[PDB]
Amino acid sequence: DLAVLRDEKTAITKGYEALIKRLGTGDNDIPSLIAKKDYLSLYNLPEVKLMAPLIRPNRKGV
Amino acid sequence: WSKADSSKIYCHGIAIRVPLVVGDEHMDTSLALLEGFSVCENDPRAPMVTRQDLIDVGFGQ
């Protein structure tokens, strides 16, 4: 209610928020994976999968 | 060169002639300015840019 931004920047911000909320404790989270050096399992998180549609599609691979 | 005299091509002021005649073959220059773009109707809202950032643009933009 106390906001003036549009759905786009708000969606980006909420995606970042969720991605940070995954910064907690417990396996399947990014800290444990870093400790195990499982840099690959991060790519398959669900949060990046929800923020992906926001990426520029014509240059998302690069 | 310029329109209304399209049958001429200046080279250091030396006017040269075209062996042909055209009234529309030249009128369509929407693709002779940039490579993968096309001119469109004027819009001040659109932001000014350079030749480098063009690579990171999308469509309908």
Q: Which residues contact A54 (CB under 8 A, 6 or more apart)?
A: A8, A11, A12, A15
Give me the domain span that covers residue B31. 25-61
The alpha carbon of residue A10 is apart from the nearest alpha carbon of chain B, in Å, by 21
Q: What is the largest CA-CA distance in chain A?
A: 42
* Residue B15 parent element (H or E): strand B14-17
Find the distance separating the first CA and the last CA of chain A, reported in whole Å: 38
Q: Which residues of A touch B59 (CB under 8 A)?
A: 58
- Could you count the other beta carbons within 10 Å of the beta carbon of residue A22? 17
- Asked whether the beta carbons of residue A56 and residue B58 sit closer than 8 angstroms, the reply is yes
Q: What is the rounded distance in angstroms from the CA atom of residue B36 to the CA atom of residue B28?
A: 15
Method by which the model was determined: cryo-EM
Provide the resolution (angstroms): 3.3
